[PDB]
């Protein structure tokens, strides 16, 4: 126990071979090495905290592992017991959590891999990318709650894909292939559906354009149109403002809906206007300016083509848009100073009227509003965690049901242990949550406490 703390390589080899000669020498060495590696890894991971750079949390661990593996290959002959002990020691390091603090490690890994895939990381060669990500999956092997990382990566991948911010679809396809080998196809089925829909959307637009050219009467929409077709099953956009589309887009909407009805019968389309963006051209200024704004922002701008001053009631009636998001959009437009607020009050109220800014000047003729999708809001992560918690609840209920039905008679501890065995890879479950799920399933009459013993449970059906 002392000689491991300050070790001599020749002495280590001698004591190792001598302990291997004897029957019972190994376990003390194994346990003490596990503890020493655990403490060293905890010291290494606790060295840095919240320094705006997440790669260290990965990189340092890599180094430590590498160092140790060299030693285990050099003088320990790579004994599998020592391999397993190193795995056990490294398991705690990544899964370390501060008291009362949730494990941000899956979030950190998701942020890291997303940053690698984002075009913000320029000058980084693809071979080096895949090498770094090969290291990344090795680090990921030690993570317990794969579901949280899955949800976060799904959201980040959707954000990247909808705006075309990825390196190249080959890179993310290689990533999904690597992840599929890592956790099975089920872990990547939704992401594969995502990629498939992304690939198909191009041919969908092509067929739509072909239909446009094939119409009996030539139709001039008056606008340049591009649309993307999304499945409800994989896209994490389940939220549904009674916003009114501007009249200029009504022709395109109706004609595209007719196209989709003719080519894809029985498919009921749904419009996510808050995600739809577009190009607007201001010509009233001294120079023609171009703005990349959302449909809600565009509707407010088009409301001014008929009147230079519009009241809040007029905008709200024309757009049928709720007060909170309408106020947000108006404030965002005021920030660029494309409009001037005609009321002295800083707060926008129902009586607020807005005038067109004929004196607007911009350094760029074509400009964009910075994508807040890259920006992180604390509420979004909490909502994602709540959704993951609900998914865990449902899955644990499922596992309890399957185990109970398969055994047709079982104990409380045996059900708990078999649930633990089934869900250990997917996430870290908790005993109290399992008991809560058991109580809920009892309430819904899936199972009933055995009349011989309340610690035994019997399938009602």
């Amino acid at each position: 126990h002392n000689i491991i703390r300050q070790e001599k390589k020749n002495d280590m080899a001698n004591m190792y071979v001598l302990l291997r000669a004897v029957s019972t020498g190994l376990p003390h060495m194994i346990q003490e090495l596990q503890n020493h590696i655990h403490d060293e890894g905890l010291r290494a991971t606790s060295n840095l905290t919240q320094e705006n750079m997440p790669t260290l949390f990965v990189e340092s661990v890599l180094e430590v592992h590498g160092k140790f593996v060299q030693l285990i290959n050099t003088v320990l002959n790579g004994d599998q017991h020592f391999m397993s002990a190193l795995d056990k020691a490294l398991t705690s390091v990544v899964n370390y959590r501060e008291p009362k603090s949730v494990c941000k490690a899956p979030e950190l890994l998701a942020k890291y891999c997303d940053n690698l895939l984002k075009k913000s990381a320029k000058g980084m060669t693809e071979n080096e990318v895949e090498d770094r990500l090969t290291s990344f999956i090795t680090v990921f092997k030690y993570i317990d709650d794969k579901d949280v990382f899955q949800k976060f990566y799904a959201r980040m991948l959707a954000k990247r894909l909808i705006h075309g911010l990825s390196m190249s679809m080959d890179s993310e396809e290689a990533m999904i292939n690597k992840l599929k080998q890592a956790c099975g196809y089920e872990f990547t089925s939704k992401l594969h559906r995502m990629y498939t829909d992304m690939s198909v959307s191009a041919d969908l637009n092509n067929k739509f354009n072909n239909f446009i050219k094939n119409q009996d009467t030539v139709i001039d929409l008056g606008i340049s149109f591009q649309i993307y077709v999304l499945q409800a099953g994989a896209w994490p956009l389940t939220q549904a403002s009674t916003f009114a589309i501007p009249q200029e887009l009504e022709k395109s909407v109706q004609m595209f809906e007719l196209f989709y009805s003719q080519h894809f019968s029985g498919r009921k389309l749904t419009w996510l206007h808050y995600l739809c963006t577009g190009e607007v051209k201001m010509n009233y200024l001294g120079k023609p300016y171009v703005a990349m704004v959302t449909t809600y922002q565009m509707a407010v701008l088009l409301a001014f083509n008929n009147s230079e001053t519009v009241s809040y009631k007029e905008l709200q009636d024309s757009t049928q848009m709720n007060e909170k998001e309408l106020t947000k959009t108006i404030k965002s437009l005021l920030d660029v100073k494309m409009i001037n607020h005609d009321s002295e009050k800083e707060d926008i109220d129902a009586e607020s009227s807005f005038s067109l800014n004929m004196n607007f000047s911009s350094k760029r003729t074509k400009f964009k509003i910075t994508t807040s999708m890259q920006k992180d809001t604390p509420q979004e992560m909490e909502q994602t965690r709540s959704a993951v918690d609900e998914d865990r609840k449902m899955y644990l209920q499922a596992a309890i049901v399957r185990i109970m039905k398969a055994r047709k008679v079982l104990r409380h501890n045996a059900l708990i242990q078999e649930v633990i065995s089934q869900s250990r890879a997917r996430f870290n479950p908790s005993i109290s949550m399992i008991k809560k799920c058991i109580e809920v399933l009892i309430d819904k009459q899936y199972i009933e406490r055995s009349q011989a013993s309340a610690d035994e449970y019997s399938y009602v059906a």
Binding site: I162, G222, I223, S224, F225, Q226, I227, Y228, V229, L230, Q231, A232, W235, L237, E248, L249, S252, F256, Y260, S261, F264, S265, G266, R267, K268, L269, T270, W271, L272, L275, C276, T277, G278, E279, V280, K281, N283, P288, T295, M298
Partner: protein, 70 residues
């Protein structure tokens, strides 16, 4: 003068979830008896002409919407 618009389309409750409500076949492939003819209906629902003909002669109702289809 020039306007460009990028949009997202979301679809659910497809008829191709059930394809033909008459037969156990795809919306584009052949019917049970046939295995040809895509006969669109004013009912906004797509079924094979062989399917809709046979299951309209015996019952004028459309099973999915519980009303008359053409």
């Amino acid at each position: 003068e020039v306007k460009k618009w990028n949009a997202v389309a979301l679809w659910a409750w497809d008829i191709v979830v059930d394809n033909c409500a008459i037969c156990r076949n795809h919306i584009m492939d052949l019917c049970i008896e046939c295995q040809c003819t895509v006969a669109w209906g004013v009912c906004n629902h797509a079924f094979h002409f062989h399917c809709i003909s046979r299951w309209l002669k015996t019952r004028q109702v459309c099973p999915l919407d519980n009303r008359e289809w053409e």
